Design an enzyme around this catalytic site. Structure first.
Site, PDB file in Angstrom:
ATOM      1  N   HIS A  56    -109.282  13.139  10.429  1.00  0.00           N
ATOM      2  CA  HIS A  56    -109.168  14.180   9.682  1.00  0.00           C
ATOM      3  C   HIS A  56    -107.985  15.003   9.983  1.00  0.00           C
ATOM      4  O   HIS A  56    -108.031  15.814  10.942  1.00  0.00           O
ATOM      5  CB  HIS A  56    -110.551  15.015  10.178  1.00  0.00           C
ATOM      6  CG  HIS A  56    -111.846  14.374  10.338  1.00  0.00           C
ATOM      7  ND1 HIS A  56    -112.453  13.901   9.009  1.00  0.00           N
ATOM      8  CD2 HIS A  56    -112.656  14.015  11.171  1.00  0.00           C
ATOM      9  CE1 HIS A  56    -113.473  13.181   9.354  1.00  0.00           C
ATOM     10  NE2 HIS A  56    -113.719  13.310  10.553  1.00  0.00           N
ATOM     11  N   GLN A  59    -107.353  18.503  12.070  1.00  0.00           N
ATOM     12  CA  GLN A  59    -107.869  18.671  13.386  1.00  0.00           C
ATOM     13  C   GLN A  59    -106.891  18.425  14.432  1.00  0.00           C
ATOM     14  O   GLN A  59    -106.892  19.108  15.601  1.00  0.00           O
ATOM     15  CB  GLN A  59    -109.270  17.896  13.641  1.00  0.00           C
ATOM     16  CG  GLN A  59    -110.210  18.135  12.676  1.00  0.00           C
ATOM     17  CD  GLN A  59    -111.585  17.197  13.097  1.00  0.00           C
ATOM     18  OE1 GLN A  59    -111.616  16.584  14.108  1.00  0.00           O
ATOM     19  NE2 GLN A  59    -112.523  17.675  12.257  1.00  0.00           N
ATOM     20  N   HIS A 204    -120.222  12.032   3.893  1.00  0.00           N
ATOM     21  CA  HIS A 204    -119.896  12.515   5.136  1.00  0.00           C
ATOM     22  C   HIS A 204    -120.683  11.966   5.932  1.00  0.00           C
ATOM     23  O   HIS A 204    -120.442  11.455   7.140  1.00  0.00           O
ATOM     24  CB  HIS A 204    -119.984  13.976   5.113  1.00  0.00           C
ATOM     25  CG  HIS A 204    -119.627  14.759   6.490  1.00  0.00           C
ATOM     26  ND1 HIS A 204    -120.621  14.638   7.332  1.00  0.00           N
ATOM     27  CD2 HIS A 204    -118.483  14.985   7.188  1.00  0.00           C
ATOM     28  CE1 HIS A 204    -120.312  15.307   8.513  1.00  0.00           C
ATOM     29  NE2 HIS A 204    -118.915  15.518   8.275  1.00  0.00           N
ATOM     30  N   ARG A 207    -126.762  13.390   6.920  1.00  0.00           N
ATOM     31  CA  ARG A 207    -126.956  14.842   7.171  1.00  0.00           C
ATOM     32  C   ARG A 207    -126.358  15.504   5.860  1.00  0.00           C
ATOM     33  O   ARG A 207    -127.313  16.436   5.519  1.00  0.00           O
ATOM     34  CB  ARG A 207    -126.492  15.428   8.654  1.00  0.00           C
ATOM     35  CG  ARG A 207    -127.093  15.031   9.873  1.00  0.00           C
ATOM     36  CD  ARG A 207    -126.107  15.420  10.755  1.00  0.00           C
ATOM     37  NE  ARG A 207    -125.051  14.456  10.948  1.00  0.00           N
ATOM     38  CZ  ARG A 207    -123.553  14.703  11.077  1.00  0.00           C
ATOM     39  NH1 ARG A 207    -123.624  16.079  10.745  1.00  0.00           N
ATOM     40  NH2 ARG A 207    -122.848  13.777  11.146  1.00  0.00           N
ATOM     41  N   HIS A 230    -119.760   8.681   8.509  1.00  0.00           N
ATOM     42  CA  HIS A 230    -120.370   8.782   9.610  1.00  0.00           C
ATOM     43  C   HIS A 230    -121.616   8.663   9.939  1.00  0.00           C
ATOM     44  O   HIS A 230    -122.436   8.847   9.140  1.00  0.00           O
ATOM     45  CB  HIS A 230    -119.895  10.142  10.017  1.00  0.00           C
ATOM     46  CG  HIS A 230    -118.651  10.956  10.044  1.00  0.00           C
ATOM     47  ND1 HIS A 230    -118.311  11.917   9.122  1.00  0.00           N
ATOM     48  CD2 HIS A 230    -117.694  10.601  10.864  1.00  0.00           C
ATOM     49  CE1 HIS A 230    -116.910  12.364   9.537  1.00  0.00           C
ATOM     50  NE2 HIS A 230    -116.652  11.596  10.346  1.00  0.00           N
ATOM     51  N   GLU A 233    -123.253   9.118  15.385  1.00  0.00           N
ATOM     52  CA  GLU A 233    -122.414   9.561  16.510  1.00  0.00           C
ATOM     53  C   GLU A 233    -123.396  10.336  17.396  1.00  0.00           C
ATOM     54  O   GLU A 233    -122.772  10.015  18.761  1.00  0.00           O
ATOM     55  CB  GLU A 233    -121.300  10.514  15.831  1.00  0.00           C
ATOM     56  CG  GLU A 233    -120.340  10.915  16.851  1.00  0.00           C
ATOM     57  CD  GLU A 233    -119.311  11.732  16.339  1.00  0.00           C
ATOM     58  OE1 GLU A 233    -119.252  12.360  15.004  1.00  0.00           O
ATOM     59  OE2 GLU A 233    -118.154  12.078  16.786  1.00  0.00           O
ATOM     60  N   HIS A 267    -118.101   5.592  13.933  1.00  0.00           N
ATOM     61  CA  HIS A 267    -118.897   5.820  15.111  1.00  0.00           C
ATOM     62  C   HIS A 267    -119.996   4.821  15.493  1.00  0.00           C
ATOM     63  O   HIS A 267    -119.794   3.797  16.356  1.00  0.00           O
ATOM     64  CB  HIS A 267    -119.373   7.244  15.458  1.00  0.00           C
ATOM     65  CG  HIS A 267    -118.059   8.258  15.293  1.00  0.00           C
ATOM     66  ND1 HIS A 267    -116.999   8.289  15.884  1.00  0.00           N
ATOM     67  CD2 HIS A 267    -118.308   9.185  14.056  1.00  0.00           C
ATOM     68  CE1 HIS A 267    -116.260   9.356  15.432  1.00  0.00           C
ATOM     69  NE2 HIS A 267    -117.108   9.985  14.333  1.00  0.00           N
ATOM     70  N   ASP A 318    -109.487  10.247  14.585  1.00  0.00           N
ATOM     71  CA  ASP A 318    -110.482  10.951  14.026  1.00  0.00           C
ATOM     72  C   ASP A 318    -110.104  12.355  14.481  1.00  0.00           C
ATOM     73  O   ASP A 318    -109.545  12.798  13.617  1.00  0.00           O
ATOM     74  CB  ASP A 318    -111.722  10.704  14.935  1.00  0.00           C
ATOM     75  CG  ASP A 318    -112.717  11.364  14.541  1.00  0.00           C
ATOM     76  OD1 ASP A 318    -112.869  11.963  13.632  1.00  0.00           O
ATOM     77  OD2 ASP A 318    -114.037  11.145  15.274  1.00  0.00           O
TER      78      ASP A 318
HETATM   79  N1  NFQ Z   1    -116.470  14.030  15.383  1.00  0.00           N
HETATM   80  C1  NFQ Z   1    -117.172  14.118  14.170  1.00  0.00           C
HETATM   81  N2  NFQ Z   1    -116.719  15.214  13.498  1.00  0.00           N
HETATM   82  C2  NFQ Z   1    -117.479  15.518  11.970  1.00  0.00           C
HETATM   83  C3  NFQ Z   1    -118.758  16.491  12.398  1.00  0.00           C
HETATM   84  C4  NFQ Z   1    -119.931  16.093  11.601  1.00  0.00           C
HETATM   85  O1  NFQ Z   1    -120.201  14.823  11.852  1.00  0.00           O
HETATM   86  O2  NFQ Z   1    -120.590  16.851  11.277  1.00  0.00           O
HETATM   87  C5  NFQ Z   1    -116.413  16.071  11.143  1.00  0.00           C
HETATM   88  O3  NFQ Z   1    -115.245  16.398  11.487  1.00  0.00           O
HETATM   89  O4  NFQ Z   1    -116.904  16.318   9.980  1.00  0.00           O
HETATM   90 ZN    ZN Z   2    -115.042  11.586  11.639  1.00  0.00          ZN
END
Ligand code: NFQ
Ligand code: ZN
Length: 449
Positions: A56, A59, A204, A207, A230, A233, A267, A318
């Site tokens: 990402h 970040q 994503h 969730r 994802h 995690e 993850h 990441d």
């Molecule tokens: N290391 C995790 N990061 C995720 C957070 C998530 O899964 O909501 C993210 O950048 O969207």
């Molecule tokens: Zn990520």
């Protein structure tokens, strides 16, 4: 043409290897035990470049800045609040500057291609830009500027939690319905193709999207593309999934979706033995991001069990607190050691050398997850490679797999000297031609933030 005294080829280590590379950056001819015959004589051991299967970009701008205790139980979840506040202020221009700088640092570390898991889509108010692909296009242009391979994964994000919970305010820049998402994939075809970049499907997390949305996207005809998500995690996600469905995240995915080799499960940290077995059986790639998973207190993946069952994995930086092939692989192994309180955990029946086991695995899983013809030096694959330091006393005194152990377990990033992507030298003697200009633009962005 280039010439290496030592190179790690698909069949193993070779000597005096002469490589012919076509104008399109593809390996055309590979001859071991050859003469240099005018070819460029490389300065050290040659390895395939490492794919970075999860990123990402924005970040990186906050990397290390979240290391401030504000609660006796700071967690992934308080970190995310901070990340949300960060992404809320980012302009398109700032996003591009951050991405370019990041990809440059990635190249210097030996990462030759990246999968950008890209979910920042809209303007600060959550309204779409005049061109909805605005930010995806800027990522592609940043990758081109740095010269790194790129699989762009535009991310479908619609909800704040299982059962299609309304998205939160902090999530407004990410949100698309399925139709808008599919239109984005469509818009991105021409420019990405022109750039030589790849595309992938991406949810994503369980969730953030609904089961029905997953079905919609997978039925939309993009059957050749990687699929990334994802999953598992954090324990909280596992608990919330159970309360929603009576199943764990990985368990649910496998019951409900036809998961296969196209898939990268990022993850997958909280996988019970049944879930580990299902993953290995499926041929899906576990996207392990060790430095970020440690930084966020995610936990330790059951890599030994997964690997024993033929599991496929790769590494991603990441959140980009670390940009180091060495660190990800070293601490993948070290994490298994700390858990088991034993040494030498990750090896194959046919390969007792730990460094070589890790490098082989990450190259293969990473290439698979990006959907690119990379991850090994064979005719027909793209000319992505790195050259280690031939003057380094540890590497020079070593041979073959011992050399990998010296680098990955006793050495570091600075042993990576030269880096080639698609036949083009993008790092030479540790230097990237764009580094000066990029750092100048980057430091200005950091000040603005
Ligand atoms: N290391 C995790 N990061 C995720 C957070 C998530 O899964 O909501 C993210 O950048 O969207
Ligand atoms: Zn990520």
């Amino acid at each position: 043409a280039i010439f290496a005294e030592r190179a790690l080829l698909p069949e193993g280590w070779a000597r005096n290897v002469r490589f012919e590379i076509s104008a399109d950056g593809v390996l055309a001819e590979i001859r071991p035990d050859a003469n240099a015959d005018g070819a460029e004589r490389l300065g050290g051991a040659v390895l395939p470049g490492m794919p970075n299967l999860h990123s990402h970009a924005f970040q990186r701008a906050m990397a290390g800045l979240a290391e401030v205790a504000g609660n006796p139980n700071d967690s992934f979840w308080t970190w995310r609040e901070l990340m949300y506040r960060m992404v809320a202020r980012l302009s398109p221009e700032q996003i591009e500057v951050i991405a370019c700088q990041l990809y440059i640092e990635m190249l210097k570390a030996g990462y030759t291609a990246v999968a950008e898991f890209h979910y920042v889509h809209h303007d600060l108010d959550g309204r779409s830009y005049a061109d909805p692909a605005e930010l995806s296009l800027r990522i592609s242009r940043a990758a081109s500027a740095a010269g790194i391979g790129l699989t762009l994964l535009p991310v479908l994000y619609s909800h704040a939690g299982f059962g299609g919970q309304p998205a939160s305010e902090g999530q407004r820049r990410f949100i698309n319905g399925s139709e808008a998402y599919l239109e984005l994939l469509q818009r991105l075809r021409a420019p990405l193709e022109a750039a030589g970049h790849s595309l992938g499907l991406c949810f994503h997390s369980l969730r953030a999207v609904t089961p029905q949305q997953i079905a919609t996207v997978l039925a939309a005809g993009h059957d050749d593309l990687p699929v990334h998500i994802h999953i598992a995690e954090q324990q909280k996600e596992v608990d919330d999934c159970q309360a929603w469905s009576g199943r764990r995240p990985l368990q649910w995915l496998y019951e409900n979706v036809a998961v296969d080799q196209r898939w990268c499960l990022v993850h997958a940290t909280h996988a019970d033995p049944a879930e580990v077995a299902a993953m290995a059986r499926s041929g899906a790639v576990a996207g392990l991001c060790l430095s970020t998973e440690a930084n966020l207190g995610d936990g330790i993946f059951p890599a030994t069990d997964f690997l024993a069952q033929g599991g496929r994995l790769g590494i991603g930086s990441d959140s980009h607190v670390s940009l180091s092939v060495v660190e990800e692989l070293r601490w993948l192994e070290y994490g298994q050691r700390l858990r088991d309180r034993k040494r030498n955990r990750l090896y194959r029946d046919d390969q007792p050398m730990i460094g070589r086991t890790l490098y082989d695995a990450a190259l293969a899983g990473g290439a698979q997850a990006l959907g690119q013809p990379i991850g090994s030096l064979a005719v027909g694959r793209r000319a992505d490679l790195l050259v280690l330091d031939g003057n380094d006393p540890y590497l020079a005194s070593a041979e073959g797999d011992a050399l990998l152990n010296r680098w990955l377990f006793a050495g570091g990033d600075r042993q990576v000297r030269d880096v080639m992507v698609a036949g083009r030298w993008v790092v030479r003697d540790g230097r990237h031609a764009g580094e000066e200009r990029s750092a100048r633009a980057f430091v200005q962005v950091l000040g603005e933030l």
